[PDB]
Design a protein around this ligand. Structure first.
Ligand code: CHL
Ligand code: CHL
Ligand code: CLA
Ligand code: CLA
Ligand code: CLA
Ligand code: CLA
Ligand SMILES: CC1=C[C@H](O)CC(C)(C)[C@H]1/C=C/C(C)=C/C=C/C(C)=C/C=C/C=C(C)/C=C/C=C(C)/C=C/C1=C(C)C[C@H](O)CC1(C)C
Ligand SMILES: CC1=C[C@H](O)CC(C)(C)[C@H]1/C=C/C(C)=C/C=C/C(C)=C/C=C/C=C(C)/C=C/C=C(C)/C=C/C1=C(C)C[C@H](O)CC1(C)C
Ligand SMILES: CC1=C[C@H](O)CC(C)(C)[C@H]1/C=C/C(C)=C/C=C/C(C)=C/C=C/C=C(C)/C=C/C=C(C)/C=C/C1=C(C)C[C@H](O)CC1(C)C
Ligand SMILES: CC1=C(/C=C/C(C)=C\C=C\C(C)=C/C=C/C=C(C)\C=C\C=C(C)\C=C\C2=C(C)C[C@@H](O)CC2(C)C)C(C)(C)CCC1
Ligand SMILES: CC1=C(/C=C/C(C)=C/C=C/C(C)=C/C=C/C=C(C)/C=C/C=C(C)/C=C/C2=C(C)CCCC2(C)C)C(C)(C)CCC1
Ligand SMILES: CCCCCCCCCCCCO[C@@H]1O[C@H](CO)[C@@H](O[C@H]2O[C@H](CO)[C@@H](O)[C@H](O)[C@H]2O)[C@H](O)[C@H]1O
Lengths: 194, 165, 61, 214, 93, 194
């Protein structure tokens, strides 16, 4: 185990002790069934990896200073232009949708086409070019899941800040740093009642 | 509207039917002294008429050239155009009481069946038990369905005597 | 031979007022009498008779 | 055992087992075991729905009448929200029917065949949660904080509290509708007006409860 | 050209061809099961009721697939009512 | 089987397990009689294939840009000419009706005449040139029947939306995406009564 969700409890027993990221947090008992156990495990890691990429892109674009994550999917509504890293790209909404569908379809299909199940979670090989999975893999996976869970929570944070505060995540961060006791989720006017 | 049936409120014949009908009673009131019971009575008939010939129109009762209120049966027409109080709503009211009477009757019949001589509790009705089953028919629809979804409302076809074919 | 005295048997005779209906076996003549099972019925036929001797095959407990 | 009326003859099929079994089946409606089971589930659903509704008509009102919120009357909020949200009645209702229909369908089949929704492979990953514990008590995804797992007597207390509070909330909803139907005011308004002159402001002196012509 | 010949000829040809190679086998199969199996044989015997008894000229056609004269006058009849329903329909309606 | 129409239900024993597409959906028990089951099974696949072609054609004539599924037999009434992909085809409703009759009169009779009850729905051979059946056919049959049940339902949707919404399938879609809550079957007038 990596710890305990509530220090002093013991309720989770279906969860294997070797499961990467096993903090023993299953309040609704969704992992009892071994097939659902495997599916949820694969879904969690996938969600984590995507969220980690999304979080890097959402803030990364702001860091470099080419716009915020929310402003990215708007040009097509206004019939503007796509621009990656500032450099322009000659595409449009329908073509991007089509190219995305086919790519994601051929890739995700193959990943699910896998039967070993463990590979579906950790394929390695071509997916392990630097081959850092030679040792300490059992703990590096904990880092992958822990950072991934944090990434998923952070992604929700970006959406919530934009939903209530409206300002960009970096801007909202500075607002709190500049006025911590004044600017917060408590004073956004959406988090608290009415 | 509906089938050329004008609303009684806008029905001129309906208005004339009032004028001429109250005149026919205000001519029978004259041949009587102002205080006589005959006259107190004819004045009540004139008031009751003037109230009815208005309660009807206020209920939006469409009437034809005859000036006599007509009723709409189609649920869609009655509901869509606010004519539900006529026929439509009354329909369920009768059905509820009708089924209530029938259900209470079968409850009693099936209780006296078995009991000693069931034939002598049909002539000399057991008023006590008959009075303990009347209110049981209030929720008859709930109980009747529970019997359909349990196969107890009807009898097996191999237990009902049938005439030779 | 025949349903036990007192046993209720469903009448199977087609032209019987008590067909598909049940009745108590008053007796069963243990001779070769064609119809031996005497069956009594609370209900009475149109004539007014409330009983009838049915054959063993005409009765089913 | 406490009865709805002291001295009332307990039916027979109402043996102290169901939460709130005060022996009240005058019209012997729950005589059939299957009927009683469905009625039991129906009661719980009715009470839970009413409790989560009277809480949405009284609570929001008591705070509006205390300046905290501005929620409209329960008999006017519908139109206010419709003009506020802008969603047409038709579309709003249809969507609700489909969502409620699906959840009702799963609960319905679970009764028809107890613990059947947990079929292997049915709801992607979750079927297990869709198992159920006793008639109207889908323990698991519901009751997450595990309050009905403490003892076998905290369940029987927390279950008598659901039924008595439900029955009360169900009657409360009927009251609110009748109160506004006759008084023409909100529930708090009716209570306040009553407490003002308690012996002069009752259902008798409303004009609609008893159309006294004589 | 587009005179009655075009409409009448086409209708006749199509129906005859469709009834000489397409529905012809189904037609024969349906005739058999209907008259031999479920239906029995009529005109048991006796009387000058041989009129109801099957003829013979109908059962004398070298035409392969046994396209009898009645079949030619059958599909062709169906065809002469399509040629005259198509032309007639264009006439008015 | 392939799943359960009502997770939890059971039975439809009259519906065999091998039947390609058995999700158990036969509430009105229309497949109890073995004979009827045979005909219904063959008809379903026949309907699916025709339905799939129709849905593709209905959207294709609009997607490519040549009109809509409804306003296509308009030329024969308005008094115009046929037009496949713009190219004017030199025919008239009368000659098309006749060509169709004989064409369908032969192919359909040929299929119906074949008596195998397994090769009347799945002939293969010339009907399977690329020989895709080899290696596994059940999954393709399920996709064929599942994709077809989608098409049969869609083809009904196009007619229904045109009858009430009075809009082309592609155009009606845009209307929904445009104002979802305000452009549905409900806000139309014919679908719902109130
Ligand atoms: C138990 C459920 C439930 C109850 C008790 C009520 C009760 C009420 N709703 Mg309602 N609603 C309910 C569910 C729902 N409503 C709505 C959407 C609305 C809207 C949009 C409106 C209401 C309104 C009303 C009030 C007036 C009814 C009306 O329009 O009649 C009109 C008919 C008459 C006046 C004729 C007399 C009727 C009387 C019963 C006899 C009323 C007190 C209205 C409101 O806010 O009141 C001002 C209103 O405008 N509801 C939805 C969404 C689909 C519901 C459920 O999904
Ligand atoms: C092919 C026909 C087919 C039909 C008629 C149904 C019907 C149903 N399925 Mg279902 N299914 C069907 C196929 C399939 N299902 C599933 C998988 C599921 C699941 C996982 C579940 C259902 C469930 C349900 C019920 C949901 C109740 C509901 O939402 O009503 C609400 C009412 C509406 C949405 C209105 C309907 C409008 C109407 C069609 C048009 C207007 C009139 C319902 C009766 C649920 C259920 O109850 O399971 C026990 C459920 O949980 N189905 C699969 C894949 C395995 C199917 C494959 O073909
Ligand atoms: C990595 C996690 C993370 C971090 C570092 C921050 C950091 C920040 N958030 Mg934020 N937030 C988060 C997650 C996070 N949030 C999540 C998951 C939600 C959805 C519930 C929100 C919803 C949210 C809102 C609505 C607002 C902020 C705001 C802010 C800024 C002011 C401080 C504050 O009030 O936060 C409060 C955040 C929470 C109370 C959510 C707690 C979630 C944590 C991670 C779980 C433990 C600040 C820089 C304010 C802002 O935008 O700046 C003006 C603001 O109004 N957050
Ligand atoms: C007892 C037999 C019976 C008979 C003979 C009729 C006959 C009629 N009904 Mg009807 N109806 C019945 C039972 C019956 N109904 C029942 C039991 C219900 C409750 C479900 C309804 C609910 C109902 C509604 C909601 C409507 C009708 C309507 C109609 C009229 C036209 C609708 C139609 O084409 O067919 C009959 C239709 C039905 C039986 C129910 C389906 C609802 C219809 C199809 C919607 C049609 C709307 C449109 C305005 C009708 C055009 C009529 C035309 C003169 C313009 C028609 C004269 C329409 C009407 O004229 O009201 C304005 C209509 O809106 N009925
Ligand atoms: C429990 C009493 C009872 C019940 C439940 C029924 C029920 C029924 N009768 Mg029936 N009937 C009854 C008494 C009853 N009848 C009596 C006493 C007579 C002699 C006058 C008849 C003569 C009769 C005829 C000729 C016919 C029916 C028919 C029918 C069926 C058609 C439905 C209908 O509209 O009712 C119809 C009811 C009547 C026509 C008259 C009976 C109405 C009385 C007032 C109701 C009985 C009340 C009872 C005295 C209450 C007892 C309470 C107890 C505590 C003492 C229906 C299932 C029809 C049928 O067979 O359908 C196929 C039909 O042809 N009944
Ligand atoms: C829809 C709501 C609802 C439902 C489904 C039930 C169902 C049930 N109740 Mg119950 N009850 C309710 C509301 C409800 N109750 C309310 C609001 C109160 C407060 C007064 C009570 C107080 C109460 C007591 C004291 C007792 C019950 C009992 C029972 C069970 C006895 C069997 C039975 O009578 O069949 C179900 C009944 C029906 C299906 C009839 C439906 C209601 C009719 C149609 C409405 C008629 C008007 C109605 C009286 C009031 C509403 C206006 C049963 C499962 C007994 C029990 O617990 O045994 C285990 C018992 O002791 N109930
Ligand atoms: C354990 C437990 C137990 C018990 O029993 C029950 C329960 C409680 C239920 C459980 C829990 C669970 C959970 C927590 C879950 C969560 C989830 C999530 C959050 C996800 C996310 C998730 C998230 C994610 C993926 C994310 C994604 C993203 C992406 C892709 C991308 C994005 C972007 C960027 C780059 C930038 C640009 O400009 C734009 C875009 C493009 C837009
Ligand atoms: C499952 C779960 C999970 C885990 O376990 C945890 C948790 C979360 C805790 C849980 C939850 C639960 C819940 C939800 C509960 C609810 C409750 C309620 C709401 C009640 C009400 C309840 C409610 C009620 C009774 C109601 C009441 C009311 C009333 C009396 C009223 C009265 C009145 C009337 C008529 C009228 C007038 O004019 C006025 C007045 C005089 C005022
Ligand atoms: C299962 C069950 C069981 C129980 O017992 C009962 C029940 C429930 C009743 C059942 C159900 C059933 C069902 C669902 C059925 C469905 C049907 C359909 C819809 C079909 C379609 C169907 C559909 C289809 C074929 C389609 C077709 C189409 C076509 C050919 C073509 C068309 C077209 C196009 C291209 C375009 C152009 O411009 C025009 C045209 C030329 C015109
Ligand atoms: C909407 C409505 C009407 C519409 C009628 C239409 C379109 C169809 C009607 C079908 C009808 C009325 C009846 C069909 C009945 C068929 C069956 C098999 C039902 C039989 C009922 C039975 C056996 C119940 C008998 C009862 C039991 C067992 C216990 C007690 O409940 C008493 C009793 C005898 C009722 C219209 C005429 C417009 C007008 C406006 C109301
Ligand atoms: C020999 C041979 C062949 C064939 C030929 C032919 C040419 C056939 C045809 C035949 C025919 C040619 C048939 C037809 C038939 C028909 C009929 C017999 C009938 C007709 C008519 C009708 C049916 C009409 C009716 C009507 C009238 C009268 C009036 C108006 C109305 C109507 C139109 C309805 C060939 C060459 C292939 C080769 C080999 C040899
Ligand atoms: C817009 C066009 C709409 C469709 C137009 C055509 C409608 C469908 C065709 C109607 C005429 C069918 O004509 C005939 O039907 C029968 C009945 O199955 C088929 O009969 C076929 O299947 C039956 C099934 O029991 C077998 O017994 C029979 O041996 C076999 O030939 C024939 O193959 C077909 O030629």
């Amino acid at each position: 185990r990596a710890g305990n969700w509530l220090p002093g409890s013991d309720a989770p027993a279906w969860l294997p002790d070797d499961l990467p990221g096993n903090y023993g947090f299953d309040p609704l008992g969704l992992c009892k069934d071994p097939a659902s156990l495997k599916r949820f495990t694969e879904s969690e890691v996938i969600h984590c990896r995507w969220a980690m990429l999304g979080a890097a892109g959402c803030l990364g674009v702001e860091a470099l200073g080419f716009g915020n994550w929310y402003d990215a999917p708007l040009w097509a509504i206004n019939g503007g232009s796509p621009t990656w890293f500032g450099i322009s790209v000659p595409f449009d909404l329908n073509t991007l949708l089509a190219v995305e569908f086919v790519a994601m379809a051929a890739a995700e299909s193959r990943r699910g086409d896998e039967t070993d199940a463990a590979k579906r979670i950790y394929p390695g090989g071509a997916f392990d070019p630097l081959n850092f999975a030679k040792g300490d893999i059992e703990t590096l996976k904990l880092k992958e899941i822990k950072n991934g869970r944090l990434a998923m929570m952070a992604c929700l944070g970006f959406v919530a800040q934009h939903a209530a505060t409206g300002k960009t995540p970096l801007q909202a961060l500075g607002d709190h740093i500049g006025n911590p006791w004044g600017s917060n989720f408590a004073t956004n006017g959406v988090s608290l009642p009415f | 509207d509906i089938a050329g049936l004008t609303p009684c409120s806008e029905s001129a014949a309906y208005a004339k039917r009032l004028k001429n009908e109250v005149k026919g009673l205000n001519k029978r009131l004259k041949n009587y002294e102002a205080d006589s019971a005959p006259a107190i009575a004819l004045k009540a008939t004139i008031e009751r008429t003037q109230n009815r010939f208005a309660n009807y129109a206020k209920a939006g009762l469409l009437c034809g050239a005859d000036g006599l209120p007509h009723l709409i049966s189609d649920p869609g027409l009655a509901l869509k155009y606010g004519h539900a109080g006529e026929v439509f709503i009354p329909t369920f009211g009768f059905l509820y009481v009708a089924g209530w009477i029938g259900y209470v009757g079968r409850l009693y019949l099936n209780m006296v069946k078995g009991e000693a001589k069931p034939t002598e509790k049909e002539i000399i009705i057991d008023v006590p038990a008959a009075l303990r089953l009347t209110w049981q028919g209030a929720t008859w629809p709930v109980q009747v369905v529970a019997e359909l979804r349990a196969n107890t409302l009807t009898e097996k076809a191999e237990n009902i005597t049938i005439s030779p074919r | 031979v025949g349903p036990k005295r007192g046993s209720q048997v469903k009448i199977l005779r087609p032209e019987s007022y008590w067909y598909n209906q049940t009745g108590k076996v008053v007796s069963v003549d243990q001779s070769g009498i064609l119809y031996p099972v005497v069956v009594r019925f609370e209900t009475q036929n149109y004539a007014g008779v409330t009983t009838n001797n049915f054959a063993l095959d005409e009765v089913q407990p | 055992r406490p009865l709805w009326m002291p001295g009332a003859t307990v039916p027979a099929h109402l043996k102290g087992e169901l939460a709130g079994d005060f022996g009240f089946d005058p019209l012997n409606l729950g005589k059939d075991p299957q009927a009683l089971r469905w009625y039991q589930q129906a009661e719980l659903v009715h009470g839970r729905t009413a409790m989560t509704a009277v809480a949405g008509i009284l609570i929001p009102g008591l705070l509006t009448k205390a300046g905290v919120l501005n929620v409209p009357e329960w008999y006017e909020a519908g139109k206010v929200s419709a003009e506020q949200t802008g969603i047409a009645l038709g579309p709003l209702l249809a969507v609700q029917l489909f969502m409620c229909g699906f959840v009702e369908g799963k609960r319905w089949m679970d009764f028809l065949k107890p613990g059947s929704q947990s079929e292997a492979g049915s709801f992607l990953g979750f079927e297990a949660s869709f198992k159920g514990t006793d008639n109207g008590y889908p323990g698991g995804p519901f009751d997450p904080m595990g309050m009905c797992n403490e003892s076998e007597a905290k369940t029987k207390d927390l279950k008598l509290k659901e039924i008595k509070n439900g029955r009360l909330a169900m009657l409360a909803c009927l009251g609110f509708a009748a109160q506004y139907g006759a008084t023409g005011k909100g529930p708090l308004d009716n209570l306040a007006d009553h407490l003002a002159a308690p012996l002069k402001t009752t259902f008798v002196d409303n004009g609609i409860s008893i159309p006294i012509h004589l | 050209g587009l005179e009655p010949y075009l409409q009448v000829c086409a209708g006749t040809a199509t129906m005859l061809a469709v009834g000489r190679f397409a529905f012809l086998p189904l037609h024969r199969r349906d005739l058999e099961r209907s008259a031999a199996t479920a239906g029995p044989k009529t005109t048991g015997s006796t009387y000058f009721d041989s009129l109801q008894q099957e003829a013979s000229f109908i059962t004398s056609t070298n035409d392969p697939a046994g396209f009898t004269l009645i079949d030619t006058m059958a599909w062709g009849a169906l065809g002469h009512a399509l040629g005259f329903a198509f032309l007639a329909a264009s006439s008015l309606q």
